[PDB]
User: Which sequence fits this backbone?
């Protein structure tokens, strides 16, 4: 019973691992979205003009 | 590391298994009806028979 309690500790440690995986991956997601949707900025259109 | 702890407590579990199997062996040898009694049985029965 103690062994399988430790196993439950293993699996919920893994799900915490994946929760902070979500944190990092979503951070990447908003960074890339902000880069893409802003695209080209007023300095670059000024250079082009 | 919690997995390591679980493995180590599995080791102590099986160590306790060996401990009480040795205890079973020693108490079986310490039982009343045993080899000395049964050798008495066989020898006396053989001679008197």
Assistant:
């Amino acid at each position: 019973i103690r062994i399988q309690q430790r196993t439950v500790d293993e699996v919920d440690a893994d799900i915490a691992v994946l929760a902070e995986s979500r944190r990092s991956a979503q951070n990447r997601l908003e960074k890339y979205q902000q880069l893409y949707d802003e695209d080209i900025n007023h300095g670059e259109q000024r250079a082009m003009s | 590391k919690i997995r390591r702890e679980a493995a180590q407590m599995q080791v102590e579990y099986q160590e306790t298994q060996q401990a009480h199997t040795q205890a079973q062996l020693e108490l079986l040898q310490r039982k009343f009806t045993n080899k000395a009694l049964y050798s008495w049985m066989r020898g006396k029965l053989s001679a008197i028979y």
Notes: Chain A has two helices and no strands. The CA atoms of residues 42 and 48 of chain A lie 10 Å apart. The helical segments of chain A are 2-38, 42-48. Chain A touches chain B at residues 2-3, 6-7, 9-10, 13 (CB under 8 Å).
